[PDB]
Write a protein that binds this ligand. Structure first.
Ligand SMILES: [Hg+2]
Ligand SMILES: [Hg+2]
Lengths: 361, 235, 380, 237
């Protein structure tokens, strides 16, 4: 049985868990926005409105049981808009802090946000999810996004909630003509975490990129899935999803690509590299291509394998200890994912989160 | 400095070594020869720490400690170094991040400390210079894109930086030539301070003309049945 | 066969031959299994110990032989159609191969019949005991009725220590112009590598079915087992194919290869869907899968949904899939040098398909490429 | 006896060529030049049979019959060959299967029979050396892994095999150097028995020093506004 009691926290708690970054930070607590702890958005270059107004929301691209429930159970909608050609100096940052309650009761929080990017705007937005403590929670999140002509998006989602939390999230990407969209998701937290990313290319000559890294530990299950529809032609899509599973953890990957008829010149590729480190670990991947146009080139490739024990032996024999050795190859493995983080400062804090689940720290 | 006694080792229950015994004192260079399959490749690996080695007999003690019970990471700190016959490529890891951590580790385990980055580059270049190495080693991925001769020569640069006490060369002469042979020699000899030691497990003998050994031992189906000095002949 | 199917019909096909009761009841559980199930969505030489005779003759003269292998790998009840074929099937082929024997010739029964189609259901069971090498070929090439006819065969293969089985398949149907059009191919073929150092190698070219249902499998239970799979599938008109594979890895150091080439034309939809599974016992498994597709024209469909579930930390799996095509300019470049468009599309695909036809015996490969050629022209 | 008169051809509903006329007899070489965007590639393409060309009037006759009423597959048999500017890659298909098929097809048409093995083999070898092609040409897949320069010379080797009557080079010299240029010159010229006639659609003046043309026309506005001999290229300057 689940209940939803929305408590309140202090600024001190925020600093100890907040990332070190100069941004426009909006804070949401137990599904509720807390103004006093958030930065103002007026004059930031970001138009922000919080209400229960749903007049604008697009219909869902792929309906499934948990989405209707969340939209319906969502306590508020975040209206965000960026006017034509505007390029904010600072990234928009949404940090999500969820907490559990004493007892056998399960605290639950649902976040709902919508972003509108007018023609030509290019901005970076980051989602950070963390647990205040060890108390369990059920986190819900939903991002619908409209990307107008010539716009460029850099979206990052960081689910760093505790090992005992449950994580179910859903972001949407809608692209217009001449659009560019880049998405990097780091699913690093929760007993069970499930992220789905659905995208629609409703405009010609567009570019899309979606990457993600999953690192499940002891008894946790992290399933990262994506859904992409190439409804129009002349679009190029690239996807890189990597997972690393240690000690009895479980990764699940799902990637559907649909290419509509007449959607000529589409170029979509998908790659999934999985690394197994525990003797009880599992990885399940199910890629799915649906192509209804011949003059196109779509392909996907996925690999699964273990750490090269010989380099590890090679590395250690010169003196590097087991924990640091194991750790060194993994940062190199995820390097291609971590390098897209243009901000060194942000990257190092992200690296710190990765390292703690390694056999170090 | 090194004492291996009545060593018996089997792998997948394979009886390989005949009961080999050897004594190495500080500041000495010893040369090891013999045919393939008599344990040469196994000896270095056994010394190095491969977990797939079932020890069916004997002991190996170093400075009064049982060496066979100590882990690989522990061996470098104490002063043991092995030049691999086939250096591994590690894509995505620069030499700089690797070596500094490795250096610190053995520095840590030896309980002294520590170089200064600023100092380290003046040291690297100088060593990078001794072996005519590419100025972009630090930025390159460990041995990636390197030829066999370059990968082998990289290990010698490695030796001077990690500063071991006992250097073991595991068939590192295979596939090389006189020119490359000339660079490795300047590196190894340069580590000779009359205290430091070297063990050369030869793939073949031509190598001994630039790095004169003081002692030579011959293996035959895993045992030394004859020992002597530099002066040696074939048939 | 019709009219009808009941318990007595089963009891009637049995007893049409003096049939022992072991053969019979095997059908009944199947039939009973069929019942509980709902129906799912749309030259003369003397051996050398070898037995190469008919399926029916085998029960009668060699029951103990039959007794040891049937249902060992594909139970009656495994799924819907495999229950129905086991029961009800009279026709088929039996092969057992004895110690130390390299089959002198490659056994084949594919012949290019022009009599119309014989029979609706069958089951072949080939067993190669240790140190065996056998090449078996299967299929038929007949013109086709203006009724929906359902071909739902099941092939079981069991391969023991140090043995090798080579399995080929060339089925080709022709229903000019568009008719039914029209045959329902619902096959369940599976092979067990029992069976240390056992090696199984599926090869198949398939054309002209209305609906296909097929999961050629390799079961690597034995240590050092090796499975390979090469599959050519064409669809045209409004045909639909749904073919793939389930690979269960259990032994140590198992290796598997899957290469599929699916061609799609007109308004047809061909989908590859297969599975690679690695049990925790399956130490150092390695698989390389390849599913290439060529689509012809812009109004048809080709789909691909592979599944990989690995539960072992010594596995090494790589999976690739790639798309290719025939472009106008590619098309024009060929035509302009005087080869027709009809003949053009046939050439490129055969080149495209070269790497699979390679694994076929060269002779059946030639036959295979000329018929694919003509099945294209009639229908593209 | 190729005769082109008052030719009008359109591309994407736009009139480019507005009445070009030309007559070509056996053993003569004609050169067509001009700036990009004047019909050259379109002219070759029109002759070749590209489906995006609506012929809005005029005629093109060969050996006294209307060629435009003949299908694309039919024109090569008659003797028309075009060396493509951008040869297509055919992964998985060897030249041998390709050439033979190309060869049998034109052999079938004309009411002649399939050549005999040994000659086809004796002919290639002789020619494969002549055009500096990889000795393992026969087994590689048509143009796969070939540089821009390598794909271009190959269509000409092909030219020397399918036995065409009229060879048209549509800017197939692009990206080729002095070294590449001379062999191509040895390839076309070696086929000259006074039998074949040739039309060279120039990219640069380059080549007419190596393959001197007999008549020269410069196209502009989709019409020939000047014609002459080899000397004409130099004179307007
Ligand atoms: Hg694809
Ligand atoms: Hg595929």
């Amino acid at each position: 049985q689940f209940v939803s009691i929305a408590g309140e926290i202090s600024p001190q708690q925020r600093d100890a868990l907040a990332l070190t970054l100069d941004s426009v930070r909006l804070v949401f607590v137990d599904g509720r926005y807390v103004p006093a702890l958030s930065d103002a958005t007026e004059g930031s270059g970001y138009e922000v409105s919080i209400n229960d107004d749903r007049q604008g929301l697009p219909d869902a691209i792929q309906a499934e049981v948990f989405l209707h429930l969340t939209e319906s159970l969502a306590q508020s909608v975040t209206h965000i808009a960026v006017k034509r050609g505007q390029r904010p100096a600072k990234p928009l940052l949404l940090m999500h802090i969820t907490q559990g309650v004493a007892g056998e009761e399960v605290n639950t929080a649902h976040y709902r946000h919508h972003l509108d990017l007018a023609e030509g705007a290019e901005a970076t937005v980051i989602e950070h999810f963390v647990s205040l403590n060890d108390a369990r929670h059920f986190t819900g999140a939903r991002f619908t996004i409209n990307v107008a002509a010539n716009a460029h998006l850099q979206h990052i989602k960081l689910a760093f909630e505790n090992p005992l939390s449950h994580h179910f999230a859903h972001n949407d990407l809608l692209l217009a003509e001449d659009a560019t969209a880049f998405s990097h998701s780091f699913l690093l937290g929760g007993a069970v975490l499930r992220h789905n990313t659905s995208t629609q290319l409703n405009g010609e000559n567009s570019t899309l990129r979606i990457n993600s890294l999953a690192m499940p530990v002891k008894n946790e299950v992290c399933d990262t899935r994506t859904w992409l529809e190439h409804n129009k032609g002349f679009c190029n899509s690239r996807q890189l999803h990597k997972t690393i599973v240690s000690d009895k953890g479980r990764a699940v990957f799902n990637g559907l690509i649909n290419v509509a008829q007449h959607a000529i010149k589409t170029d979509g590729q998908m790659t999934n590299n999985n690394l197994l480190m525990g003797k009880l670990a599992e990885v399940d991947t199910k890629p799915q291509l649906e192509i209804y146009a011949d003059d196109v080139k779509c392909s996907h490739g996925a690999t699964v394998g273990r750490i090269d024990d010989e380099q590890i032996f090679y590395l250690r024999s010169r003196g590097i200890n087991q924990q640091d050795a194991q750790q060194m190859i993994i940062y190199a493995f995820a390097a291609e994912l971590t390098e897209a983080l243009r901000d060194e400062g942000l990257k190092q804090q992200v690296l710190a989160r990765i390292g703690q689940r390694l056999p170090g720290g | 400095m090194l004492s291996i006694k009545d060593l018996h080792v089997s792998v997948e229950d394979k009886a390989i070594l005949r009961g080999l015994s050897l004594d190495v004192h500080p500041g000495e260079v010893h040369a090891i020869m013999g045919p393939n399959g008599s344990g040469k490749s196994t000896l270095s690996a056994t010394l190095a720490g491969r977990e797939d080695y079932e020890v069916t007999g004997g002991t190996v003690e170093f400075k009064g400690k049982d060496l066979l019970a100590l882990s690989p990471e522990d061996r470098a700190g104490e002063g043991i170094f092995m030049a691999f016959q086939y250096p591994v490529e590690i894509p995505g890891v620069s030499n700089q991040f690797f070596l500094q951590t490795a250096l610190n580790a053995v520095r840590s385990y030896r309980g002294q400390e520590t170089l200064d980055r600023f100092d380290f580059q003046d040291l690297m270049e100088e060593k990078i210079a001794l072996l005519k190495m590419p100025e972009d080693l630090l930025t390159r991925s460990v041995n990636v894109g390197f030829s066999g001769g370059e990968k082998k020569r990289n290990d010698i640069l490695q030796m001077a930086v990690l500063e071991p006490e006992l250097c073991i060369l595991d068939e590192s002469d295979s596939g090389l030539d006189i020119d490359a042979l000339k660079v490795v020699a300047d590196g190894v000899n340069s580590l000779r301070d009359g205290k430091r030691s070297f063990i050369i497990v030869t793939h073949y003998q031509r190598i001994l003309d630039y790095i004169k050994p003081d002692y030579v031992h011959v293996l035959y189906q895993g045992r030394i049945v004859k020992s002597g000095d530099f002066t040696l002949v074939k048939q | 066969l019709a009219k009808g199917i009941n318990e007595e019909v089963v009891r009637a096909i049995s007893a049409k031959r003096n049939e022992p009761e072991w053969m019979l009841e095997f059908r009944l559980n199947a039939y009973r299994a069929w019942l509980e199930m709902e129906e799912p969505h749309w030259e003369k030489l003397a051996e050398q110990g070898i037995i190469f005779c008919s399926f029916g003759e085998a029960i009668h003269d060699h029951p103990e032989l039959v007794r040891k292998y049937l249902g060992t790998v594909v139970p009656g009840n495994d799924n819907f159609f495999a229950a129905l074929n086991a029961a009800v099937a009279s026709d088929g082929t039996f092969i057992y191969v004895p110690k130390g024997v390299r089959c002198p010739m490659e056994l084949s029964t594919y012949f290019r019949i022009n009599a119309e189609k014989t029979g609706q259901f069958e089951r072949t069971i080939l067993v190669a005991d240790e140190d065996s090498y056998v090449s078996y070929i299967e299929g038929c090439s007949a013109p086709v009725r203006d009724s929906y006819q359902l071909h739902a065969a099941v092939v079981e293969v069991i391969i023991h220590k140090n043995a090798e089985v080579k399995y080929s398949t060339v089925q080709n149907w022709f229903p000019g112009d568009n008719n039914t059009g029209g045959i329902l191919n619902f096959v369940t073929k599976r092979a067990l590598c029992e069976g240390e150092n056992s090696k199984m190698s599926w090869t198949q070219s398939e054309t002209g079915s209305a609906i296909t249902w097929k999961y050629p499998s390799c079961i690597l239970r034995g240590d050092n087992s090796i499975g390979e799979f090469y599959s050519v599938a064409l669809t045209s008109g409004h045909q639909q194919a749904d073919t793939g594979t389930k690979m269960i890895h259990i032994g140590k150091n198992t290796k598997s290869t899957i290469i599929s080439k699916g061609i799609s034309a007109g308004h047809s939809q061909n989908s590859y869907r297969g599975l690679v599974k690695i049990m925790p016992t399956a130490t150092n498994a390695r698989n390389f899968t390849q599913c290439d597709s060529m689509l012809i024209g812009a109004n048809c469909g080709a789909h691909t949904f592979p599944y990989v579930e690995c539960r072992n930390n010594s596995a090494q799996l790589e999976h690739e899939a790639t798309t290719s095509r025939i472009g106008e300019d590619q098309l024009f470049y060929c035509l302009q040098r005087g080869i027709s468009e009809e003949d053009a599309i046939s050439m490129i695909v055969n080149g495209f398909c070269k790497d699979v036809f390679s694994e076929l015996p060269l002779e059946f490969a030639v036959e295979a490429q000329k018929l694919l050629a003509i099945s294209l022209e009639h229908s593209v």
